[PDB]
Amino acid sequence: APAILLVDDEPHSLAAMKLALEDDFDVLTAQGAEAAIAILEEEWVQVIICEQRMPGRTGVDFLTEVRERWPETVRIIITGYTDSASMMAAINDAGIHQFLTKPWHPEQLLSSARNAARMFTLARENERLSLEMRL
Amino acid sequence: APAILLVDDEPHSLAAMKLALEDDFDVLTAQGAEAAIAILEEEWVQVIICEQRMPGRTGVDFLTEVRERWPETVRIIITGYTDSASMMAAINDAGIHQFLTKPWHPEQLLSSARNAARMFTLARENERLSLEMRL
């Protein structure tokens, strides 16, 4: 069973988001891009939820690399940040699958996560069928 | 190109949600279960966003019928209603793809919708490959 990885500058938020998710996933938890890549090199993640507004490397810059390296992973930005249009285009340039806002509701967060997981499953099995039919 | 159907008791909310969505979909708009089924019998909808808390027939009761009749359609409940557990189990009994809360943010709503559309596309093409490989 693959994990969900939560990536956020602010550890209180990581531990809150995990409360909403632990009952339904293996939750993995990272405190910035660097830590999160370290985890991605190390194990199997179906879904990532990542704060945009982090020190140093942004959510999208992080997730653009992820889209490059683990293309199968479903990517989600979440931010409480009252919106710049620039952030949106940046999010839109990268293929980000969901944008969520803060504060989040546990049932909405959970539902987004489950929905990202089902999408991971579909894409992955969609690809299995392409490869297999070719043969 | 298939539509998004918004279903809500309260027409102000329908016309607001369409503002967030019109630039990216053909938005269709219904003011209760009955009106919404009438539209579903009549045309092609990839995604439905539907208030739960409607007079007479509920969001889930509506969407359970929809799951029966147009199984390909991606189904979304949205409600400002501060939560009963009963509502959640009911939502969970039916295969509802997203639960959203009110008030909604235009970029989060739009993102949910786009994401439901991509999922409609995947499921639909996932099925096209099953059928075709069988042959």
UniProtKB/Swiss-Prot annotation, chains A, B:
Residues recorded as bearing 4-aspartylphosphate in the entry: 51
Identify the residues that the record assigns to the Response regulatory domain, covering every copy: 3-117
Question: Where is it localised?
Answer: Cytoplasm
Instruction: Sum up the protein's function in the record's words.
Output: Probable member of the two-component regulatory system involved in the regulation of the [NiFe] hydrogenase activity. HupR1 is probably phosphorylated by the sensory component and then acts in conjunction with sigma-54 as a transcriptional activator.
What is the protein name stated in its UniProt record?
A: Hydrogenase transcriptional regulatory protein HupR1
Q: Which organism is it from?
A: Rhodobacter capsulatus
**Gene encoding this polypeptide?**
hupR1
